[PDB]
From a paper:
LGI1 is a 60-kDa secreted neuronal protein, which consists of the N-terminal leucine-rich repeat (LRR) domain and the C-terminal epitempin-repeat (EPTP) (also known as EAR) domain4. ADAM22 serves as a receptor for LGI1 and is anchored to the excitatory postsynaptic density through PSD-95 scaffold.
We crystallized the complex between LGI1 EPTP and ADAM22 ECD to elucidate the mechanism of the interaction between LGI1 and ADAM22. The disulfide bond between Cys260 in blade 1 and Cys286 in blade 2 stabilizes the whole β-propeller structure. Trp398, Tyr408, and Tyr409 of ADAM22 are stacked in layer and project into the inner rim of the central channel of LGI1 EPTP to interact hydrophobically with Phe256, Val284, Leu302, Tyr433, and Met477 of LGI1. In addition, four hydrogen bonds are formed between LGI1 and ADAM22: Arg330 and Lys331 of LGI1 hydrogen bond with the side and main chains of Asp405 of ADAM22, respectively, and Lys353 and Arg378 of LGI1 hydrogen bond with Glu359 of ADAM22. In our pull-down analyses, the W398D, Y408A, Y409A, or Y408A Y409A mutation of ADAM22 almost or completely abolished its binding to LGI1, indicating that the hydrophobic interaction mediated by Trp398, Tyr408, and Tyr409 of ADAM22 is essential for binding between LGI1 and ADAM22.
Author numbering:
A (entry chain B): 224 to 551
B (entry chain A): 233 to 625, 630 to 718
Write the structure that this text describes.
């Protein structure tokens, strides 16, 4: 196979997200410099992506969609003016601002992640400021409210939700991983009794990790550790801790996103200085190997979009044009 | 003037034991890493504040910590300045600590406001981070020392705002996307600080750096006779004078306030006028291209008439202290307000707090007690307000005060030490003491009861600055010369 170039959208982007609303596939694009949260819609007639709707916010970083019982909610992380929560109205056909995240608890957001634990919906906001604490919110039917703060006085860059097996258990339990500046990645474990994440442990061997993203092959659980300079790493989870698999040189990298397309496991390592490298999983090698080579200016994210047996690859650009790829 | 000049911060860096461990117990790595931090902070300062950050000294605690580093940056800052007082003997305009640890505060560092040129306040502390990040940390730490504080009164009012929506500004909360610019409001505060008589030690231009000589850096290093700046800005000044860091055929100098078309400015030419009544004017030596080192009157000289007394080139008055905390529109209360409220020793006026109970001020130590202002607001320019604002009422005088806490120990809202409380009397720990209690040094004088033989002014370097046609270290010798 190959990732062929579909189209190049004439604007910059930071974070790209996808979701399913009323059996249609949408794509949310966060525009840092303009302010818009750009929603894309699929045209089944012209086989292209239209412009569904926008959400205006002065310095958006993340636009995370949450779908609770067919109702669409969007978390808008802003560096200016504070973060807000929007709700899509089916009747008025618009987005409504229904909730405000206080500007003092969350000041410099950098990543938003969503997860579901025993029929409860949550989301976590990584705050890269010291005064701003990484906070978990909980869905209580009408809106989201503070549930737990983590990593005080830490410059948290990314959050990642994990479901991992702790030896000698046999069932996957919820986990969170926090990446902070000049610091080791932290693994939080979910405690059902207290209904909050505790028992934190550092990931040794990793200094200055920017972000963490996980994938699963053969039932085993892996993660991709990203550095800007130095070497990115791939690790396997084995009961109690993560183990070394391989490593790759990171030349100004901001992304190391694992993707699973058509039961094929891919891994796209972005680069600001050079060409973005796509990796494929090797069954014999139990390792990632060189696959295809992309060319995008300062990639910030890679997201997989599946529509009717058609697989698309969205690549965000911080200085250049955001690119859409076709997987054939 | 004083704000159009290029300022120079002679900085010393101290690397603690944890900073040394972060660089794998390597001396050469700690130095280059710290230099990188300083250089990037320099590029920030050079562009906006017209000030250079120059590394003049550095030491690294390779063996162990000299004292216990606290998670509280304010606690750490003080113990560091004590170490600085007793163990550091190299000269610098400011001494900053590079800690490999991380603070458990909202700030990535701490530094005394208006602290530069001082021995106890001339410093700050900075936590470890990425090179670009720590540079910002140093910039905002040195900003405090340099007098730059984000005016909360103007912030809340919307009078001062950061126009950068994405990266924000230096004195604001720092996140992943780092700031690059000071606000225009910050610039004004810095200028106000210099015009107030602050930053006197910032006008000596460093020559030999801690790095290999570089022609086109704007610094006269080893081997080179001069150094204009950059080929772009050398055109403005020094182009005709300096060629490839070498003086031309007909040139005594290249650039500077005392340099005119590659020639020295004659002795007696004013190169820097006094910013206030605490300052001493500087004249060109005639033998140097740079203006003479910025000096001022010693501590003890009066200012604002008899209402104030000079300290560190700055005038300490109750009126200015009120303006410093609550705003320029705010003025000090009448002496009658003090003469009644302070004596009571109530919450509405006192000479300090002793175990849940206020101290009732003595009748002489009334001007050294609870600070009283007029036309006060509800938000201080700096620090945190602890409690509520005191407001007390033929003329009826509105006495207002307030408790502002920078430190758990330091409380703004009481009369600052050194503030005049009468003829030849000042405040010391909420007590009115004579001038002899402060143990001021004195210049040489050959006439009894006069300073510098009644023909000169005693500088802060404890030297006599003689008047016109007077010479000698005691300014007693008369010298006639048109
Ligand atoms: C919470 O996480 C700990 C991991 O260790 C924790 O992290 C460090 C950063 C520190 O904070 C430590 O103080 C802290 O304990 C889990 O500890 C692990 O528990 C398991 C059993 O639950 C232990 O298994 C045993 O390990 C011995 C080792 O020789 C084996 O031979 C045995 O067969 C047995 O399986 C494991 O050793 C222990 N790990 C460590 C490093 O102590 C802890 O279980 C976890 N708590 C919960 C509720 O999940
Ligand atoms: C949503 O945002 C997009 C921005 O990508 C808008 O597209 C812009 O439309 C304006 C005209 O209104 C043009 O001037 C711009 O050049 C367009 N931008 C790009 C990148 O092509 C789109 O119109 C917005 N939609 C709504 C409903 O506001
Ligand atoms: Ca994340
Ligand atoms: Ca100096
Ligand atoms: Ca030079
Ligand atoms: Ca002077």
């Amino acid at each position: 196979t190959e990732f062929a170039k579909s189209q190049d959208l004439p604007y910059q982007s930071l974070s790209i997200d996808t979701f399913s609303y009323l059996n249609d596939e949408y794509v949310v694009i966060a525009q840092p410099f303009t302010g818009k949260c750009i929603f894309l819609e699929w045209d089944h007639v012209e086989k292209t992506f239209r412009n569904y709707d926008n959400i205006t916010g002065t310095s958006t970083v993340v636009c995370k969609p949450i779908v609770i019982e067919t109702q669409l909610y969007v978390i808008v992380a802003q560096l200016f003016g504070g973060s807000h929560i929007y709700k899509r109205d089916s009747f008025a056909n618009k987005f409504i601002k229904i909730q405000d995240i206080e500007i003092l608890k969350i000041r410099k957001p950098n990543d938003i992640e969503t997860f579901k634990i025993e029929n409860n919906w949550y989301f976590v906001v990584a705050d890269s400021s010291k005064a701003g604490f990484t906070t978990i919110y909980k869905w209580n039917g009408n809106g989201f409210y503070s549930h737990q703060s983590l990593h005080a006085w830490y410059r948290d860059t990314d959050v990642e939700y994990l479901e991992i097996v702790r030896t000698p258990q046999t069932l996957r339990t919820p986990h969170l991983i926090l990446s902070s500046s000049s610091q080791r990645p932290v693994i939080y474990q979910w405690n059902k009794a207290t209904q909050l994440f505790t028992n934190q442990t550092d990931i040794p061997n990793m200094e200055d990790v920017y972000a963490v993203k996980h994938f699963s092959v053969k039932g085993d659980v892996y993660i991709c550790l990203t550095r800007f300079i130095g070497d990115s790493k791939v690790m396997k989870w084995g009961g109690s801790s993560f183990q070394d698999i391989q490593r790759m040189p990171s030349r100004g990298s901001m992304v190391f996103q694992p993707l699973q397309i058509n039961n094929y496991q891919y891994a796209i390592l972005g680069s600001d200085y050079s060409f973005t490298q796509v990796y494929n999983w090797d069954a014999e090698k139990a390792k990632f190997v060189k696959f295809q080579e992309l060319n995008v200016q300062a990639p910030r994210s890679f997201t997989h979009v599946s529509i009717n047996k058609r697989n698309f690859l969205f690549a965000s650009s911080f200085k250049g044009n955001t690119q859409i790829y076709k997987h054939v | 003037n004083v704000e159009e000049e290029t300022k120079y911060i002679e900085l010393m860096i101290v690397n603690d034991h944890l900073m040394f461990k972060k660089h794998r117990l390597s001396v050469v790595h700690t130095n280059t890493y710290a230099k990188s931090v300083v250089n990037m902070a320099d590029l920030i300062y050079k562009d906006q504040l017209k000030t250079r950050i120059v590394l003049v000294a550095m030491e690294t605690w390779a063996t162990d910590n000299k004292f216990a580093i606290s998670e509280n940056p304010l606690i750490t800052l003080r113990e560091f300045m004590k170490y600085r007082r007793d163990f550091i003997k190299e000269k610098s305009d400011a001494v900053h600590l590079f800690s490999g640890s991380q603070f458990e505060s909202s700030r990535s560092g701490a530094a005394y406001i208006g602290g530069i040129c001082s021995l106890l306040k001339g410093g700050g502390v900075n936590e470890f981070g990425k090179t670009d990040l720590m540079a910002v940390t140093l910039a905002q730490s040195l900003a405090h020392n340099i007098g730059i504080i984000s005016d909360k009164r103007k912030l809340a009012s919307g009078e001062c705002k950061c126009e950068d929506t994405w990266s924000g500004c230096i004195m604001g909360d720092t996140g992943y996307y780092l700031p690059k610019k000071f606000t225009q409001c910050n610039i004004e505060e810095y200028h106000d600080f210099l015009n107030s008589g602050g930053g006197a030690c910032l006008f000596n231009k460093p020559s030999k750096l801690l790095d290999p000589p570089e022609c086109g850096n704007g610094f006269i290093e080893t081997g080179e006779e001069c150094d204009c700046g950059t080929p772009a800005e050398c055109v403005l000044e020094g182009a005709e004078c300096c060629k490839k860091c070498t003086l031309t055929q007909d040139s005594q100098c290249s650039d500077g306030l005392c340099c005119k078309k590659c020639k020295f400015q004659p002795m007696g030419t004013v190169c820097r006028e006094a910013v206030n009544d605490c300052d001493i004017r500087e004249t060109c030596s005639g033998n140097s291209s740079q203006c003479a080192p910025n000096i001022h009157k010693m501590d003890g000289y009066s200012c604002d008439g008899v209402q104030g007394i000079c300290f560190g080139g700055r005038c300490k008055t109750r009126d200015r202290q009120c303006k410093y905390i609550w705003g320029q529109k705010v003025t000090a209360s009448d002496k009658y307000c003090y003469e009644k409220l302070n004596i009571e020793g109530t919450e509405k006026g006192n000479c300090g707090k002793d175990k849940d109970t206020w101290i009732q001020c003595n009748k002489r130590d009334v001007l050294c007690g609870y600070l009283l202002c007029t036309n006060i607001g509800n938000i201080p320019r700096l620090g945190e307000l602890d409690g509520e604002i005191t407001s007390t009422l033929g003329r009826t005088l509105n006495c207002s005060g307030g408790h502002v806490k920078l430190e758990e120990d330091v409380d703004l809202g009481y009369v600052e030490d050194g503030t005049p409380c009468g003829p030849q009397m000042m405040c010391l720990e909420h007590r009115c003491l004579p001038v002899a209690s402060f143990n001021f040094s004195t210049c040489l004088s050959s006439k009894e009861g006069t300073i510098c033989s009644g023909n000169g002014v005693c500088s802060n370097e404890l030297k006599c600055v003689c008047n016109r046609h007077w010479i000698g270290s005691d300014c007693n010798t008369y010298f006639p010369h048109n």
